[PDB]
């Protein structure tokens, strides 16, 4: 069973269309190796992949309207460090078994605490620390956030402007 | 000072601004432009040569020469004599042509090593380089081979100093070799660039000399002191061609990233950038200088 011990979770209350500029500001400050970004649909996934590639960020998109072998081939290419950023609508579970991924953005809100657990919690071998940031846009995001706080009994506060480097990086 | 006037003249001549789209049937390898008025010529993969006249600024066609057996690799107008040119091709022969009578003056079987050809600035001799390091000096008037040298490491582009005394070449180590032409001896070797240098070219003023390496760095040097003046870190790919303006103040460089950059010699900053569909492979000027000819991966004139 996946656990959340050793993880830093925060939230930002902001508008929907301003998440791209705020995410770019986070990409300009936070040092990262590989980042998985969670979206909700196919067209948002392809548009975000276009926005990252046209802004020279090496990113690969895996959405739910894909064949299974193509998803496995892109996941195998993502294992071999061919592109840093992965815009993923969904995965095949098993946590996140790739230790290189450190920072995970919930660009869109997950279904319940179980989908949030599958998005955030990891099943690595040596890398147990990591950062996860969920974007809050309305009151319903805050309600599901307090639901996750009630289920998993963790503290999710406001994302600060200065983040320590040795707290979530091994 | 010169930047604002250069930008104003650029906007004016761009508002005044042709495009000979697919003039040859195949990939155009080079274009050259001399003869202080306006007479152009270009060579391509389809063993054709084309000679153009430039009147009031719409291109017209004068000549289309056949007779080759392989693709045209290098074309160059004669600088000093009246209007003549020499074509290089992979059909083991070099062809010195007549513009006036529209015939080949001399078809000289040298070797299949015919890659890149140039003149000493007196116009007396023609140097030709290769892939196998053997550089051949052939008199343009005697039409007879005179000298054969071998660098034994690598050669990409050779050139002639304006005094007709120094002969410059490059290699695969980024070095530049300097030879004395009446001595035919290797005088000096500079280990400058880490990657190999592709294209070199002098200026009509004789003041500066740029070497373009594969590390996307055009290093502009002094001619007399042989010191490294500055560089141009504007590109993101290896530089394919270099060309100098006839005032000696501006220069144009092109590479794989489709971006023809016109920078200033005295300042060391980019003055203009233009883009197109394909990577530009050769750029040429003309001594009256409102215009820029260039051929890409099609001959296009640009008002600058």
């Amino acid at each position: 069973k996946l656990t959340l011990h050793g993880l830093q979770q925060y939230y930002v209350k902001l508008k929907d269309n301003e998440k791209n500029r705020k995410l770019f500001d986070l990409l300009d400050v936070l040092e990262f190796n590989q980042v998985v970004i969670f979206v909700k649909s196919v067209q948002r996934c392809i548009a975000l992949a276009q926005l990252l590639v046209e802004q020279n960020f090496p990113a690969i998109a895996i959405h739910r309207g894909m064949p299974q072998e193509e998803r496995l081939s892109r996941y195998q290419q993502f294992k071999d460090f061919q592109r840093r950023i992965l815009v993923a609508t969904n995965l095949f579970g098993r946590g996140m078994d790739i230790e290189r991924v450190n920072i995970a953005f919930n660009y869109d809100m997950p279904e319940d605490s179980d989908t949030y657990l599958h998005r955030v919690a990891r099943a690595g071998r040596f890398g147990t620390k990591g950062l996860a940031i969920t974007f809050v846009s309305d009151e319903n995001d805050a309600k599901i956030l307090n639901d996750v706080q009630d289920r998993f009994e963790v503290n999710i506060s406001e994302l600060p402007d200065e983040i320590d480097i040795s707290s979530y990086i091994e | 000072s010169v930047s604002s006037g250069p930008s104003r003249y650029v906007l004016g001549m761009q508002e005044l601004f042709t495009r000979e789209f697919l003039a040859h049937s195949a990939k155009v390898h080079s274009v050259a432009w001399s003869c202080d008025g306006r007479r152009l010529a270009s060579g391509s993969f389809d063993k054709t040569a084309s000679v153009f006249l430039l009147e009031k600024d719409r291109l017209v066609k004068e000549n289309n020469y056949r007779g080759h057996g392989d693709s045209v690799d290098q074309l160059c107008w004669h600088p000093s004599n009246p209007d003549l040119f020499v074509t290089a091709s992979g059909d083991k022969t070099i062809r010195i042509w007549d513009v006036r009578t529209t015939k080949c003056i001399a078809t000289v079987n040298t070797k299949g090593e015919n890659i890149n050809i140039c003149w000493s600035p007196d116009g007396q001799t023609i140097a030709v380089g290769n892939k196998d390091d053997v550089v051949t000096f052939i008199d343009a008037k005697t039409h007879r081979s005179k000298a054969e040298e071998q660098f034994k490491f690598e050669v990409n582009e050779i050139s002639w100093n304006n005094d007709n005394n120094m002969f410059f070449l490059t290699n695969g180590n980024g070095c530049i070799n300097i030879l004395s032409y009446p001595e035919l001896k290797p005088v000096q070797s500079i280990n400058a660039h880490p990657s190999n240098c592709i294209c070199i070219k002098f200026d009509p003023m004789g003041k500066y000399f740029a070497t373009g390496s594969a590390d996307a760095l055009v290093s502009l040097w002094d001619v007399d002191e042989l010191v490294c003046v500055r560089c141009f870190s504007r590109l993101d790919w290896p530089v394919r061609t270099l060309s100098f303006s006839h005032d000696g103040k501006m220069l144009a460089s092109a590479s794989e990233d489709h971006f023809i950059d016109i920078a200033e010699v005295e300042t060391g900053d980019k003055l203009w950038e233009v883009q197109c569909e394909s990577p530009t492979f050769t750029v040429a000027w003309h001594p009256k200088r409102p215009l820029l000819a260039f051929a890409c991966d099609t001959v296009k004139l640009f008002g600058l």
């Binding site: 040092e31 190796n33 840093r84 480097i165 | 400058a192 880490p194 010191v227 490294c228 993101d236 790919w237």
Partner: protein, 422 residues
């Protein structure tokens, strides 16, 4: 300065040299507009060192302290001028000039702090772009940043390798296009990164092994560093990894000390009585003073690493192995060995098995047959020597034999087994 130093540049003076040194001390780092006199000072120093008075050399160290900062300020044309600085530099004083880049060359000018901030920005930008698909467009960019500001960028990428878990092969594929003079700067930045007070150290050691096996850096400073930390742990393992980078039947396919002890004052008697057996007995202070060198160092490094692992699982062996570093122009031999550089090369049933494997191409089989015939002839010669030694030759003697056998067993490889059988 152009007028005053005409005839010396026309060739290629102590009052003149002191006056020019005072002029360059009063100028400072603002030679960014004039590379010509920079190259002239380089050529004058090169001609002086080819003709090579410690005061002139110390003032030359001071003017290099004063003239590295224009190369720091030039954010153009440093891919080539670094080679003129290397023509100046071509030992430990070079490392002291590189240690001047810690805080002395910086934070004394506003423009250098601006350049530092801009190169940290562009360094972080290109470190957020490196992939294994990024097959050298990015090497051009990191080279363009590393021509002008080598120390900041090298410190930043070593911080990235230390903190972000084996990003090593895109880093070396990016540093493929690095200049000649920046290699010693990278070596000193390695040495400075080793001064930080264990998986990150393993990753850094593997990075050092890859860069050192790839490039001619002439790493004598790393040898001085590991010798100094042996005179004061894991640096021995880093040196063993660097030496492996530069160069049960499979182990059995590959002693004289016990036979000499069979035939302290007995060590002096054996020295009075009687190649590689000297180093073999040296494996067994001043009382001990009375390409096989790489393997001889590797065996001692393996014994020291085994002692360090036995200490870490729960220091007498460190004194001998440092002596193995003390007995070691060895850096010129290590670079020639790296420029020159499997189990069948060492090479009797094993020789017959190797010849049968080479049989199932004729030149290698003929070479293996010649090596096997030479091994058979040398085995016949060694059998004759063993017969000559046999023709030459209570409980305390058995205890002495057990004490001689146990130390050779626990102090060496599995080859003590064959010696014990003999």
């Amino acid at each position: 300065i152009h007028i005053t130093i005409e005839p010396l540049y026309r060739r290629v003076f102590e009052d003149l040299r002191r006056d020019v040194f005072n002029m360059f001390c009063y100028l400072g780092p603002h030679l960014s507009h004039d590379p010509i006199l920079f190259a002239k000072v380089v050529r004058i120093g090169k001609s002086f060192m080819k003709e090579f008075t410690e005061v002139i050399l110390s003032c030359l160290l001071s003017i290099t302290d004063q003239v590295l900062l224009p190369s720091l300020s030039l954010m153009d044309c440093n891919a080539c001028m670094s080679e003129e600085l290397w023509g100046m530099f071509k030992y430990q004083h070079r490392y002291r000039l590189y240690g001047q880049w810690k805080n002395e060359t910086y934070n004394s000018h506003p423009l250098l702090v601006k350049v530092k901030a801009q190169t940290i920005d562009r360094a972080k930008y290109i470190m957020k772009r490196l992939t294994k698909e990024n097959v050298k467009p990015s090497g051009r960019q990191i080279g363009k940043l590393s021509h002008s500001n080598p120390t900041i960028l090298f410190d930043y990428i070593l911080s990235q390798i230390q903190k972000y878990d084996n990003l090593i092969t895109p880093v070396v594929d990016s540093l493929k296009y690095l200049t000649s003079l920046n290699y010693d700067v990278l070596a000193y930045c390695i040495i400075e990164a080793l001064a930080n007070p264990s998986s990150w150290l393993q990753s850094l050691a593997s990075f050092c092994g890859a860069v050192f096996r790839k490039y001619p850096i002439d790493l004598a400073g790393l040898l001085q560093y590991v010798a100094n930390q042996l005179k004061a742990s894991f640096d021995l393992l880093i040196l063993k990894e660097v030496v492996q980078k530069m160069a049960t039947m499979e182990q059995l396919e590959a002693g004289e000390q016990l036979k000499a002890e069979g035939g302290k004052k007995s060590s002096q008697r054996l020295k009075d009585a009687l190649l590689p057996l000297c180093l073999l007995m040296a494996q067994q202070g001043v009382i001990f003073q009375e390409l096989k060198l790489v393997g001889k160092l590797y065996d001692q490094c393996h014994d020291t690493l085994v002692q360090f692992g036995g200490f870490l699982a729960s220091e007498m062996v460190m004194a001998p192995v440092h002596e193995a570093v003390v007995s070691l122009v060895w850096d010129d031999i290590s670079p020639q060995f790296y420029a020159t550089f499997m189990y069948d090369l060492a090479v009797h049933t094993s020789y017959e098995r190797e010849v049968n494997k080479l049989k199932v191409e004729k030149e290698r089989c003929t070479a293996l047959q010649d090596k096997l015939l030479e091994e058979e002839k040398k085995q016949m010669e060694h059998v004759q020597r063993v017969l000559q030694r046999l023709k030459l030759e209570n409980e305390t003697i058995t205890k002495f034999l057990q004490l001689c056998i146990f130390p050779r067993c626990i102090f060496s490889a599995i080859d003590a087994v064959y010696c014990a059988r003999f």
